[model samples]
Target chain A: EQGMCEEEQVARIAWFYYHDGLTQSEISDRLGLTRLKVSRLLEKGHQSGIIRVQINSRFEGCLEYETQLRRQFSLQHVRVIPGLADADVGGRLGIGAAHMLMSLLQPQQMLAIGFGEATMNTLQRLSGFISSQQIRLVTLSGGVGSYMTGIGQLNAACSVNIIPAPLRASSADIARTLKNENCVKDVLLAAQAADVAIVGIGAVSQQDDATIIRSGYISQGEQLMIGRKGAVGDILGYFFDAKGDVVTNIKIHNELIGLPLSALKTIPVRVGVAGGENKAEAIAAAMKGGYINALVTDQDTAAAILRS
Target chain B: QGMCEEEQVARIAWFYYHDGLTQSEISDRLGLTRLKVSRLLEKGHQSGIIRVQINSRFEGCLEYETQLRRQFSLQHVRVIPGLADADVGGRLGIGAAHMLMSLLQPQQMLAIGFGEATMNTLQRLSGFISSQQIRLVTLSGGVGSYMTGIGQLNAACSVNIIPAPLRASSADIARTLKNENCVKDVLLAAQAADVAIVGIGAVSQQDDATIIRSGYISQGEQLMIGRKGAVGDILGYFFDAKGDVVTNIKIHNELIGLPLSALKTIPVRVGVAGGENKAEAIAAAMKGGYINALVTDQDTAAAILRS
Candidate 1:
């Protein structure tokens, strides 16, 4: 009985903060709790992703949010997953991209995929739709040990042209040699020739959830310089500033081997799947570059990006 | 069944997850030791009783799904992803709700079957179907354990439940009950059910079966039916690897519900059960042409395809 009352307090706290738009101090006064406990319940309300898809999807509740973002960025597509309170928006973002790609993909069109927590979450869900269409796939960049495992796990029903090269070489000297290999060169043609490209937008934060940092290509060293240089986002292995131009003078510069920015124009559709408030600036920068014409993210992150 | 271990795990999962109760509180309320509550949660988690570290839309294994529908001549088919470590009710339950929910229409009727996963399916759809005022008709009469605590659905939805024991004490008693107007009406409605849904029971593990857990059929009786070449069942009628219902089993005479043959004419027959353990039983159910639609995970799908 007491537990039920405590749980009720947690929900009331979440309601005050998320739906009522109350600040921590305001919520503390309303709920008769310290602001500290309010934040704790906010996270508690966020967990428990059970029955999310079944009960979730106030479908067009966030349509205006998507339209606002689309107009702001001059993008072709934007999906802001709806909710002030949610069971699991993080997982929804990936499935959101999965459904988007399922609709966008056509039979026999080559789709180029990049690896990260975002696209890794996105790619595994496509084969059910793909079996009907029989589309081919190519890797946009290399160093996708994670993507390779799921592709194998998916036991893909169609052809896959994989480019096995490090995302960033040990040095520029090693990068050129890798790009020159006949096997890598052959697969690069497929990625370049793709009708659609899907990848992740990486936040510049050193937070544990940052895919680029968590995936371990860079260290705390690069994040410091990237932040100092006004770079807030990275797409396709290259960091970009808020103005959407490439950030140069980095040690990893000239070390990337895969589909280049010049080749990105060859693809008609470009999609980026990324979420979290930390990535708001990163997603906005990518959108400013016109690098991604479509975006998939949570509503809170959408609001944050607009605010930024 | 009433007071079964699975229900305990399910109740704990709901409280811990949906109610935000700590394990200690659950232990106190449910009258179990903290460590016992802890183990039940672990078992429930492993039994595939929950969701999402990225529980996205599982449309099932793509190629295998294509193959299964074609081979079985199914109207609709979905094969969820395969995870060998542990999965069945959790993944299959989600897919089941998707299948069942897809069939609901306003002012329409739906017939339900029983299983470990059925509990979740009802909980999930109770919110959606009620808004549409869809009618729920029970296929079988269940005693204490089979379908319990469903009364809260009277937030009051249009629900039709069979008012009799699922398995009567004697064969003559089942016949007499079926002749009663109240029992006969629910059975006739089931005969023309909108979406006839039921779970498959593998006779290889009778004690694990929901009907067995109902404590209606004896262990020795299940063995007798097993010796008579029974492989599995759908809606309480035991059948073989060839989908032929084993007739001489005395329990068949004592069970009251829609007959297996009635499913042949029902336009919508959706069976929601799966496991590598239940592969033969599921395949037999499909082979019988009893269930025209199926929702299951990939490992079980792969296993049945091989058979």
Candidate 2:
């Protein structure tokens, strides 16, 4: 009769302990050996001089933290990637959002994309994975410039409908007039009818600068004006307060070139992707306002939301 | 359960993983004792508050090295990706040291070669915990000074060095080396070594200066050796364009060290060297079956495989 040698037994125990992350007791039960023998085999594995464990401190415990955050925050979906600090959160958050987009996008589906760094990041990552030929992309906001628009259209190789107006006009009256233009109205009609919309929540009252500050679509006075009106965060140019109530008093709200909040709420999947301690209140406000039915965020922001 | 307790574990796990902070650092930052911080980290994992995602960087590096090993038909190959502003010697040394440490056991004998590259790699291998009793034996004589002095940079361990110059002053000195007890003992200890770590020196006009400074040869002799088509030197034994030993070298018989035949007898001989100039020499060594494994950088590995 054939039987395993001692070396094979030792290797089996080592595999269970290291690769399987099983306890010694668990290993013993699997191998039909005593815990004492299992412990000795583990020592022998190290003694045989073949094991090397390289601990990557950055990613240690990232999945468990993400799972906890998802359950605690009641998020439909969540991702936690290892990052150096909140400053590096943008790249990690973007990659996560991009991965989610690949699973969400399908042939002939309308994928509405909003402006900001996170959306730009998702587009860059989604470049190679986009194979859906019949999918249609509709830009939710205007004045995104050639840089953002070019990458999405060139990479996706699909039909794109871009809103042909500035993100915000100088006054509410000008915005009303611009909205009437057919070039602007047609894109808005497509955006309002999108199957899924992806947007970034911009935190207004934070020490760290928001993507909108650098976006150059809105003036500093307008930002300060919105912040003073208890604006916590924004999605698709729709600003909301701490309690998720829309701050309709802001002049830019009326002048926005994208679909209105009423239209956004009607979309089947409104995914808001953002993260950071500073964006926690804004994300909560977005959720409370029903601005986004689905959310993608990082660990720190997920914890803060649970606490908030 | 205390609401504060759950928050405490989350904060601890965050600080430990996200920021790459140590337990003690977390303890100091959170105003707790070191023991308490350790317990909380353990508790965090147990309570399902901590989960890990292996980053893509490590997996990518591993796959690249694996592909390289398969392409070259090598037993092992470590490819360290180029880092900006990193010291080439220190990085190559650390990589070699890591590979050696993985091979070490509690009571095994390790044979080491003498050279600037191998010396640098040995210094970085300080903190490996092995239960096997180890004897670090130098492969060459009098060059014991280079090996032992650098090997001591880590910690006190058992070491055996061949007590004779790399090359004798004359044929008489080389003859006497055969009878010397210390040199004889070190050679015997090395013969049974399970693993050997050595360095490869590629022949070049610039390398002539280092060979002269090493006192094994002069500028004239270095030039003459190159005329013999010597492409590389390992443990003072020069090999030619086809990796065959160059027997006509001036120091071949006068050199007192472990022979090339003995080095080949070793189960695992790891050669650590890199750079553009050394790529051809490294390739020759591998082709000649001089080394079973190699530790090098990304650029040099690509260069060798490309050519």
Candidate 3:
């Protein structure tokens, strides 16, 4: 009609359907075209539009909250994923975050998963296993073996549930403890530098238990700071108070894998997912810590998060 | 009070302070009563319970979730590990839905991945990727060979994105052409497979491109069908329509590897992973299609087929 060849005519119509709410293969079928032909036409349209189309900047939603979050948390990027108050809140958060991650996944994507609860759990539950031959899933932390490594006192890292503080015993003794260990250093080195990180939130109060303590997840003194620090929960085992403020629980902080809040952003995407009202505070705390770009949860917890 | 007894009290107090709080939680330096004698504290210090007190309310913890994230460095996604162990006979069985997801990864760019995790998660990722494709070919038609990015499909899968054939601008003239063998090969190959392996990703629909229409990645239409216990994957097929399955899942679902149903007609047919968190959903995958053999972490491996 435009005095163009057959391919040219097809290209014009295909471009219309592509940008005009028509599905790829759908357009092909409707137009008696093969899916491939439709794709070709779209490509041609892109080339032509590049030849004649104009780019426009239009705003549909306010970027205010997004900007505020980035500035307040000093984050590189932040994505406030959906929150649902469903019975499977965590699952929703999990899948949502996964979807976001999938969007970002690329060849040679190096993913370092801490061997704790969430990665292990998420890996197990993940389905539709796509073969990212280029991607690799590495364990960031020691798989509960570092504690048993017999590397001596020098290697004892703190769990996020544990908080650290000056020991009442003596500054002298604390000095001695700091001077002695290799095992802790090794684990610290492993977690210190990571490209991407995914983790679970640990509540301060929850870590105060005998199981966590006896299991050597945290030191007794660290537990005291969790009380004193008034931390709501932990990100990578680093305690944070009700407002997502990083807790200055030194004793516990000394033993963990990842570093302080300032260091979280070295990686591109820091996604966090948790459920239930009890966890709401911790989620907020983690977000406040910085660069938690993605989040997922159920409706009830989502509501609680808004309230928080 | 200033002599021998005072010395003894001082020694005990020192022990509590230095050794720190105990498992039973019996140590506070400021108190003197037997609640003191029992190493207990004053009336107002109830927050002093430093023991692993169990709150049966089952409020899923943020702390647990946080640790997993940092430990794993799972930035874009992370999942709640299953608490239940693999117990085929129990109500909350092992190999729950999460077991499959742990192996697969669904993306935001709206493309499918191929291989181990993708295959495993696919059993549950139905109605999410695409309706059904009758053609099969290398991912992205072997484009770039750079393996750096996927133009139309996902870079992760590197599969060729076959555009559908269009009718000639003039339909009457188009009918004169003969059938193309190349396209026919892909269509036939796409069929006949019994099961597709898949991965399960923790995808959230809220504001996420994966669930948002007009989003770059894939279809959010399926994400519209909300359902509880949605473990995103299928037999190499994924859907967002909420835990529902189509009969063709066994065949047309054939994604990267082989086809569906007849998958057993091939080999191993094994699914391996861990964590009890995926119990219900993984079971759902087994019911839907894909996975006869299940491999999983100690805890989740133990929990398959229960509830």
Candidate 4:
């Protein structure tokens, strides 16, 4: 007020306002600046640290590049969480997305969480909760069997509602009988009526073991056979391609029941959280699969989506 | 001074109290006897039929059965749900025991209720509510996971927390992790848990199945192991006739988690529902281990007492 003239003061004030919560249109109106100028100001604010933007997104905007993200892809909803443009971004983004998903949980609500890098991140995030509501948290599919040494679900306090069997069971009959048991049946009931399902969409990656198979749930031959058939990712343990169609004849298709893809839209809310440049295709696949109606994600994927 | 008998009928009064409408009230009013009138009056509320009785078991020395149950096991209390003769009495007993245990172990109990048949039983209890600090543990080496934050499960105990090693790794890594003294921190913390909830297993009928066939257990292997063990176990870890750790499962043997023996020193060791199939194993587990409390269905408890 004392040193700078009105025009100079307005520029600095515009810079501060742009850095905070106001949208571009609101910023333009507040300072009589144009939308273009507001956009440039936000970009400069980021470069200047007047706006310290910390994105946890990996691939930025590839999923929601434009209106076509919803119209062309037939996606119900999309979001991209930014990775800090740092290494370990894959694992870190997975975990951060997990925490964001967790914040939405309410007491006694049914939570259907799927498995994989994102699911593991979700469970890890679950470790920070203040209390256990009479919530029924179930696994969407049979996790890698090697992980099920003794008591399953006891490590985490989650209820073993639907015990997804290993992809390769001793036999279909055995799987059927195991599925029918009163014990497994009770948990499965909870899975079907889940209030909110937190699913990690899958992506094929070569560096790590294939998500489901190498974990000792499905065999290498099975993985090769299934992947070649065009299964891109999964939702609540249901594998699908870009069109959200089942790729393999997993036995769960017969006995397992949860919110179906169409019903997922009708649910109060279905949240899909995923990340990574590697996962960009999978994320796109998830959108194409049409399971998620709402999303929370990172920036790189968001930006990549625009380019895609 | 003659009173109108119709105006002064006890049956009519009973009908009004029991039945919501007037149809049964008329029938009760027509009946001269006061008791019959009252019963008819009670019937007035429901579609002119469906007679019900307010039987009080507490008054009829039915408490004797409860007394007998309390004397027989570690359950601090017992609850018996009404069942008809046609239904499988044994299954009903398991169901009742399931409901009672579920009702008593509130969710906030900060204790660990183990998995398997008993937990499955508890799931059917429709009205049970959670209390505080209720944490479930798989005491043996099974890694069933729930996604609750660690604080709600572990923070209050003030003991060291030992987490299981890599999930999708070799059994040997689990073995090494068990041998490491640091893992005892979890055991110590678990030892401090307010209540230890566990279920009993019966020998499987098929080569592969137990009452609770942990999907991981193969049929041939499950039967083979059951035959050798001869007795049931609390977690997947087998125990001897004395509830001492059987040496066969190396990782379970080396692990410093709560020993059935050490559990005797802990307070409120609640054993959940068991039934006909598990009768002997449950009895043996109670005798060999430190099950100061027992939760079983009406059928099983009746069978055990009669036997």
Name the best candidate (by TM-score): 4
* Predicted candidate 2 versus true structure: per-residue lDDT over A1-308, tens digit per residue: 12678888887777878888999898877866888978887787787875655656666555666676656545566566666656577787878888887777776788788887777777767655554446677888765332243242333234667664456655576556556656567778888899988888888975326678766666678788889998998887788898889996777888775688878887778888887788889988888787786788777776677676
Tens digit per residue, CA lDDT, model 2, B1-307: 3436557878888888878898888877776899998998875543234534334546225655776677657777787776664656567776777677667776677888877677766555533322234657778765324532332321235665554456665665566554544456678888778888988887763443354677667767777888888887887777876878887777878778888888888889898986767888887787777889989888777777677
TM-score of each candidate structure, all chains considered together: 0.41, 0.41, 0.32, 0.42
Weakest 10 consecutive residues of candidate 3 chain B by summed lDDT = B42-51
Displacement of residue B209 (Cα, Å) in model 4 is 24
Q: Model 1 fnat? A: 0.00
Tens digits of per-residue lDDT for model 1, B201-307: 88887786665776666889889988999998877899999988987888888777777887676788888777677888998898888889988887888888896
- Decoy 2 TM-score against native: 0.41
Q: Each candidate: how many clashes?
A: 3, 12, 206, 81
Q: What lDDT tens digits, residue by residue, belong to model 3 across residues B95-188?
A: 2223322332343222222333433233222212222321113221111121121111111221322211121122221221111223233333
Which candidate number would show the highest DockQ if scored against the true structure?
Answer: 4
Which candidate would rank higher by TM-score, 1 or 3? 1
What lDDT tens digits, residue by residue, belong to model 4 across residues B176-199?
445433344456656666556566
Worst 10 contiguous positions by lDDT, candidate 1 chain B: B143-152
For model 1 chain A, give the 10-residue run with minimal summed lDDT: A48-57
Per-residue accuracy of model 3 over A1-308 as CA lDDT, tens digit each: 23667566555565667467677777765655577877776777667664254445342111334344456546554444444244354554556555655666565455544433444445434323223324444334332222111111111121121001111112333323322223223334344454566666655555445323544556778677676868777665566777666666456565443344566556567766555666666766777666366554544554565565
